[PDB]
Design a protein around this motif. Structure first.
Motif, short mmCIF file in Angstrom:
data_model
loop_
_atom_site.label_atom_id
_atom_site.label_comp_id
_atom_site.label_asym_id
_atom_site.label_seq_id
_atom_site.Cartn_x
_atom_site.Cartn_y
_atom_site.Cartn_z
N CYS A 99 -11.76 11.65 -5.39
CA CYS A 99 -11.29 11.60 -4.01
C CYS A 99 -10.53 12.87 -3.67
O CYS A 99 -9.83 13.43 -4.53
N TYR A 151 -9.00 4.28 -3.85
CA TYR A 151 -10.11 3.83 -4.69
C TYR A 151 -10.38 2.35 -4.58
O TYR A 151 -11.53 1.91 -4.72
N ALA A 152 -9.33 1.57 -4.38
CA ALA A 152 -9.45 0.15 -4.05
C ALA A 152 -10.17 -0.08 -2.71
O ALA A 152 -11.02 -0.98 -2.61
N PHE A 153 -9.88 0.76 -1.71
CA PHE A 153 -10.68 0.77 -0.45
C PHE A 153 -12.17 1.12 -0.74
O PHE A 153 -13.05 0.49 -0.16
N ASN A 198 -0.46 4.93 -1.13
CA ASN A 198 -0.62 5.59 -2.44
C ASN A 198 -2.05 6.08 -2.74
O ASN A 198 -3.04 5.44 -2.39
N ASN A 199 -2.17 7.27 -3.32
CA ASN A 199 -3.49 7.80 -3.70
C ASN A 199 -4.45 6.82 -4.43
O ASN A 199 -5.66 6.80 -4.19
N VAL A 200 -3.90 5.99 -5.31
CA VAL A 200 -4.69 4.99 -6.08
C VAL A 200 -5.41 3.99 -5.14
O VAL A 200 -6.59 3.59 -5.38
N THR A 201 -4.69 3.60 -4.10
CA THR A 201 -5.13 2.58 -3.15
C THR A 201 -6.45 2.95 -2.50
O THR A 201 -7.23 2.10 -2.21
N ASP A 252 0.86 -1.20 0.00
CA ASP A 252 0.00 0.00 0.00
C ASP A 252 0.89 1.24 0.00
O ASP A 252 0.55 2.23 -0.66
#
Lengths: 143, 144, 144, 143
Positions: free
Chosen positions: C71, C38-40, C33-36, C25
């Motif tokens: 986000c 969205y996975a949450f 990471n910022n991308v992560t 992560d």
């Protein structure tokens, strides 16, 4: 031949994520190594005092492997068994197994190997004694 | 350094594929994370099976299950380095196939990492092993 | 600091789910990471739809397509911190639903990040929008 | 309303990966933000001299968004359009779009915002002039 829960010493639950499933609908093979990385390092931080942000000593992963026995899928609840097969001067061999929470027989079992090095130069070094103590505590009783 | 296994060379592999690195390939210590290499293995192999062996991942009746894999890491790479994967088939059986793969810097001979994995081919719905389909076999045979 | 939007509070969300952080992560600068995030968001929402709304992701005839998301990031967190996602439904229509989500440290009130995303529900094979199924609607209505 | 190729200044090809596809078979929504991160930072390193390993100044992502128009799947070949909507003192707003290589109309288009800060303390700072020069070079001509 499938590892059993009672053959590991420490357990880490890991929550599953949407994109853990791939196109065929089960947790992708790659993700198991992320579970291995997460289980080992959670423990070294929590029990061995490892400082990932600013520590002078870091673990490099020099090798890994996994055998896959039966699949799991998001959103099933899973837990990693962790043990140490051999603690050397500057390297350590870990064995892991993924279990469904509330199940005896592992879905997958693997191993990986850390070599501890100086952060900037990557020269192999004595495992800080705090880390050594935590690693020895995971010693495999398997056989 | 890292893994002490004998480092494989480029000429030991039969097919090559570039894979661009991504920002988050790097982890907190600054190099491509060990896990990511298995994603490169999966990518290199399936890219080939689809493009050369006709595999239909969206609607195909037959799928590859990864039943074992492993990797040795000899030296780091880091995003945004350009990498390439070498691929060969070490064995090709009726329902299963063992791949050998290695990552190289593009423009280079010594492997940064090398590993293997096994597909077993199964019926999509039941997961009963079936034989590797003829068109996919033919493509795999060209890598052995 | 980071995003200057008004920081949402825990009490603005109706349902909570812990999500364990993973090694990778963190990215090269040391935080998740910022991308992560969205996975949450994807995880928190689908966990709910399956467990509470009966969604069948393996064999279900109806699927959610994410058609927009966003986000704002107010403050970092880092593996191995324990986090939790707050979820509410901001609007619930015939075929589409807008979620609001925020990440919190477990044991804390101010959001580290907050964002949104929209599902449109479509027929699995054709991708023709259909209405959100009754059992899934009922579950979503409890978050609005 | 779908962005066209000629509305962006810089393009980055990104190769697709097996697990980009999720259970429903198309590239997962999350992965688009990884493409945004990768496209912007590839450019700042290659053209703006950014030093991610040891630079004193780092970009924090303070916000992002994406609208998804039509899907793509591994192993299709995709390319990111990149432009700068507004370059501020210490922050910059990027606009991006994913295109199939050999197609005019974007599959997805998004934006994200960097604030440049001191690596250790996270205090906002003047964009190093080398980075400023590269960012200005991406200035959007869209409308």
């Amino acid at each position: 031949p499938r590892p059993l829960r009672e053959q590991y010493l420490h357990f880490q639950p890991i929550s599953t994520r949407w994109h853990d499933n791939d196109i065929y609908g089960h947790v992708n093979n790659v993700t198991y190594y992320a579970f291995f990385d997460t289980a080992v390092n959670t423990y070294l931080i929590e029990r061995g005092g490892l400082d990932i942000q600013g520590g002078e000593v870091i673990g490099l992963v020099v090798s890994s492997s996994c055998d896959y026995f039966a699949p799991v899928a998001f959103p099933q609840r899973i837990e990693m068994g962790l043990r140490v097969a051999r603690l050397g001067n500057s390297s350590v061999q870990y064995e892991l197994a993924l279990f469904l929470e509330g199940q005896r027989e592992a879905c997958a079992a693997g191993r990986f190997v850390h070599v501890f090095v100086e952060r900037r130069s990557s020269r192999p070094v004595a495992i800080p004694q705090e880390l050594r103590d935590a690693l020895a505590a995971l010693q495999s009783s398997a056989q």
